[PDB]
Amino acid sequence: IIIATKNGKVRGMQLTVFGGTVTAFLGIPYAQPPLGRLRFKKPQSLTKWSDIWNATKYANSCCQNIDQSFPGFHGSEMWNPNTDLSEDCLYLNVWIPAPKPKNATVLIWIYGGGFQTGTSSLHVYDGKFLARVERVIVVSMNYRVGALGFLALPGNPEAPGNMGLFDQQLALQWVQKNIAAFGGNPKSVTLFGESAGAASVSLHLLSPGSHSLFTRAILQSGSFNAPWAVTSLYEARNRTLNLAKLTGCSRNETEIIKCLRNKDPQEILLNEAFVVPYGTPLSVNFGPTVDGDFLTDMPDILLELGQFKKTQILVGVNKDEGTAFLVYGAPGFSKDNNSIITRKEFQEGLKIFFPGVSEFGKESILFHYTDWVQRPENYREALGDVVGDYNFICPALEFTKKFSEWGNNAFFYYFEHRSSKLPWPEWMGVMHGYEIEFVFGLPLERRDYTKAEEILSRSIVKRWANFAKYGNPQETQNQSTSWPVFKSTEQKYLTLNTESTRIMTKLRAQQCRFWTSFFPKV
Ligand SMILES: *[C@@H]1O[C@H](CO[C@@H]2O[C@@H](C)[C@@H](O)[C@@H](O)[C@@H]2O)[C@@H](O[C@@H]2O[C@H](CO)[C@@H](O)[C@H](O)[C@H]2NC(C)=O)[C@H](O)[C@H]1NC(C)=O
Ligand SMILES: *[C@@H]1O[C@H](CO[C@@H]2O[C@@H](C)[C@@H](O)[C@@H](O)[C@@H]2O)[C@@H](O[C@@H]2O[C@H](CO)[C@@H](O)[C@H](O)[C@H]2NC(C)=O)[C@H](O)[C@H]1NC(C)=O
Ligand SMILES: *[C@@H]1O[C@H](CO)[C@@H](O)[C@H](O)[C@H]1NC(C)=O
Ligand SMILES: *[C@@H]1O[C@H](CO)[C@@H](O)[C@H](O)[C@H]1NC(C)=O
Ligand SMILES: *[C@@H]1O[C@H](CO)[C@@H](O)[C@H](O)[C@H]1NC(C)=O
Ligand SMILES: CCCC(=O)SCC[N+](C)(C)C
Ligand SMILES: [Cl-]
Ligand SMILES: [Cl-]
Known part of the structure; x- marks a missing residue:
């Protein structure tokens, strides 16, 4: 099938899913390749083309160091890029139902990876199941990560910082201007992401330039107020310089960038790992910074003073968020x-x-x-x-509390089911990032999971879809537990599992009081 976009024609491919069919457009370019003099700069508008662009395969993944702590282990390798790495990586994917919808709600995925890794071509981010089962349009994009996407030199257009966030924003703009052609509704766009992806979503709720690019937001295991989500201006500076010295580029800050723009992507990737004297297993060496463009002030201030897009949000975390990082240090x-x-x-x-x-x-x-x-x-x-608690749960709960205080409906979930196919050992429990497969509906595929997991995934997919379409995460047909709104006083949240879903209150009350009130002082 051929669709006409503002920059040219694109051809997709037909996919067979659950006795039905989905149309996928993998690898549509949405910006000029950030190469040469463009490295470290904000994404430039794409040049329109002639002839038909074949969008039949995932595009290149952005340059990034790969996890090599467990060669041959699916537990860790499933997160590694499954597509050629390249600086030419600003592409996005689109999954639309078939027959073509007329005004479908759009789900835009933003992958996590600590702002240093990740790609939208991962198997667990395949949007064809959602496009099939819920008739929603699924979009996902690749954005620059690591130094190539977040190198910060505040005020300097050569390396302003948050370039990756601007890539995401440019991708959201693409949907605004083109999704109607694919039968989508630009007025009904829900952003969702996990970990750094979630933190990204939360930052779009704070960025004025993104206010009109989406309707709602879903944040899974992540928010900008997480201790690893925002790089301080001091840290950024000490890191940009440390990277300079490590690549023999120490200098006129502008000349430093000119020097770094001659370096090979690998030389840069190789040195990113030592910019921090003693980093943690979260290793967010280069992340979002208060740049004065995308972010106009410290996020904590904006959140606290109600300066953000007023809408509904769906936020949640997994039972054992932290275990996964224990084996990395x-x-x-x-x-x-x-x-x-x-x-x-x-x-x-x-x-x-x-x-x-x-x-x-x-x-x-x-x-x-x-x-x-x-x-x-x-x-x-x-x-x-x-x-x-420190890195995910408490920051997520605090974000939810503060956000809802300004009148918007918010829903919070606590994911406590451990995948029957989890490669990691039992002591790690309900790990960070393993609810993703349920959200994307992989368990719906019987060719693989227990019956209970199929049902759980179906319920989650329906709730996520209903939230995207109507701003209310309910499953109204199968006598399901009603998901109550989260309010600062009562703080009710919903537990997601195979056994029985419950309505609980004040998740980690004692632990968060410690992380949110006391610890920030020491
Ligand atoms: C800011 O960076 C300095 C310098 O970092 C060093 O040089 C970088 C290029 C990289 O190779 C780092 O690993 C180096 O440490 C940090 O100061 C260093 O601190 C370490 C602590 O182990 C010490 O061994 C070095 O001697 C220090 N080097 C100098 C010149 O002072 C400093 O800690 C960073 N600032 C913060 C807040 O962490
Ligand atoms: C669990 O394993 C760790 C790591 O040890 C490595 O992996 C094991 C599976 C095995 O292949 C070992 O030969 C490897 O060295 C054990 O931790 C080590 O413990 C020893 C002695 O206590 C210590 O000298 C090492 O520094 C530790 N390595 C690190 C940094 O983890 C641990 O003892 C094992 N747990 C159990 C079952 O007791
Ligand atoms: C796109 O795919 C079609 C498949 O038949 C092919 O004819 C065409 O040459 C492809 N486009 C390019 C530029 O390769
Ligand atoms: C899609 O829905 C919006 C309201 O949500 C409406 O304004 C728009 O006209 C619709 N697009 C279509 C079907 O043309
Ligand atoms: C509702 O229940 C039916 C049959 O009991 C099941 O097949 C279906 O998957 C459920 N629907 C949702 C949205 O969970
Ligand atoms: C490095 C600790 C274990 C992980 O979280 S690997 C990547 C997970 N995800 C890309 C889903 C955030
Ligand atoms: Cl239930
Ligand atoms: Cl003490």
């Missing part, structure tokens, strides 16, 4: 044994996750998380919760 941990660690190892673990923190700061963490209720796995579980 925490001493005594391993995906090949029960990882029963000691108090001493736990203490060294804190050193790893809280590098620049005072000794008293770490002791307070120990004090708060070690009042045992003896059990050999006490420290193993405490460290996991420490990492999860």
